[PDB]
Amino acid sequence: VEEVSNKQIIFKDYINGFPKESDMILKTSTIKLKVPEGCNDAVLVKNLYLSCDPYMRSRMSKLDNYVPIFIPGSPITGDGVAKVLDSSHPDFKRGDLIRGITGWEEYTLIQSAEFITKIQDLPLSYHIGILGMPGLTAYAGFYEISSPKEGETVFVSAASGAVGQLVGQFAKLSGCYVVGSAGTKDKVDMLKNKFGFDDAFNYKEEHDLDAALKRYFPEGIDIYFDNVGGKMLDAVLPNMKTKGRIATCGMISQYNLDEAEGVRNLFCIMTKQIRMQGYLVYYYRHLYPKLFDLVVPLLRQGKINYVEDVAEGLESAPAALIGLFSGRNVGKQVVRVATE
Numbered sequence: 001v002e003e004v005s006n007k008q009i010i011f012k013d014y015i016n017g018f019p020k021e022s023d024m025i026l027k028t029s030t031i032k033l034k035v036p037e038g039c040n041d042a043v044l045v046k047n048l049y050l051s052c053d054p055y056m057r058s059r060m061s062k063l064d065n066y067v068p069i070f071i072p073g074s075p076i077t078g079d080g081v082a083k084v085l086d087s088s089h090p091d092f093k094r095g096d097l098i099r100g101i102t103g104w105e106e107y108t109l110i111q112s113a114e115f116i117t118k119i120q121d122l123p124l125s126y127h128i129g130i131l132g133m134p135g136l137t138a139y140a141g142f143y144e145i146s147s148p149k150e151g152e153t154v155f156v157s158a159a160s161g162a163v164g165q166l167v168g169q170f171a172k173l174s175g176c177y178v179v180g181s182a183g184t185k186d187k188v189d190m191l192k193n194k195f196g197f198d199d200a201f202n203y204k205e206e207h208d209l210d211a212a213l214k215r216y217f218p219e220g221i222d223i224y225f226d227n228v229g230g231k232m233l234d235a236v237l238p239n240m241k242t243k244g245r246i247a248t249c250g251m252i253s254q255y256n257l258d259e260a261e262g263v264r265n266l267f268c269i270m271t272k273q274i275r276m277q278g279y280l281v282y283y284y285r286h287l288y289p290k291l292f293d294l295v296v297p298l299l300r301q302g303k304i305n306y307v308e309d310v311a312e313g314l315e316s317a318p319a320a321l322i323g324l325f326s327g328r329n330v331g332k333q334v335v336r337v338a339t340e
């Protein structure tokens, strides 16, 4: 039984405002590469990829919190891809590749097993992106929540991100006219060139968001896929069509504010008869087969594209997570901990 070093990213303590790299601490611990005797229904894994996700910011402040907080002194946890080294669980065996909740470290003794699934060709990292939680988020928000119909107009914010880039391609599959906003020229070019968006604009260079939306949506928006909230959401509301739908997926412009911004155009919910509906992807896990059945053939034919941002090494993970809130990532942010 080899006992080896185990680098970990430890959560320091609760924060306010924007997260900093000193809120996460590199610690070198030790681990024996065997499931402990008397420790049952557990899986010991070597972590291969880690996902960086905006919701992780909310785990860094103590609040009624919608996701359980990080524990100070303990490793950051989140979605990852890992290889089973040893198992006391009947459904996992040495060599299996899994996806699910694991530790921000080289090796994790996963004690529940509820939060992991065995990986069924495509890049391993896809299982925490288009074939994982962000892909399921895009599928549930667009197809289940938004009720898209052929010919409808669709606006997507954070459109080059892990979720948004898929929403735009689903909208094209549905025969919709789709526009996205993103924060750099490169992201805007990628929206039109690889994600098949009909148009796109850099919201950071638009001094009048209402005017920008009217450029692209002269007769209004049928479906707004909201990833950002805040001023963008407020500009969208008067530009919705009657009976338009807003899929409230996230509001990343708010996650680092002590006081959330006021949204002032909600009267448009009445005047435009809008259905604004939020959702949490965990309540849609039963749709994973429907996601796979749709996107796996398209990926194989190269008819749907997925762009990832791969940070190299566990030590790069804190900066990769902080970069989400400045738009440093181009596509789905992942961390490569080890090859395998």
Ligand SMILES: NC(=O)c1ccc[n+]([C@@H]2O[C@H](COP(=O)([O-])OP(=O)(O)OC[C@H]3O[C@@H](n4cnc5c(N)ncnc54)[C@H](OP(=O)(O)O)[C@@H]3O)[C@@H](O)[C@H]2O)c1
Binding pocket: 053, 054, 055, 133, 134, 137, 158, 159, 160, 161, 162, 163, 164, 181, 182, 183, 184, 187, 227, 228, 248, 249, 250, 251, 252, 253, 254, 279, 280, 281, 282, 324, 325, 326, 327, 328, 329, 330, 331, 332, 333
């Ligand atoms: N409901 C659910 O269950 C669920 C599940 C997963 C994700 N979500 C939400 O979905 C949204 C997108 O997630 P993702 O994983 O795809 O992240 P992502 O788009 O891959 O990365 C985050 C992006 O947010 C944009 N951003 C950051 N700060 C911003 C600001 N102040 N204003 C506008 N845009 C900003 C940046 O893109 P730009 O360069 O374009 O600014 C950045 O690249 C997030 O709000 C997340 O919380 C919800």
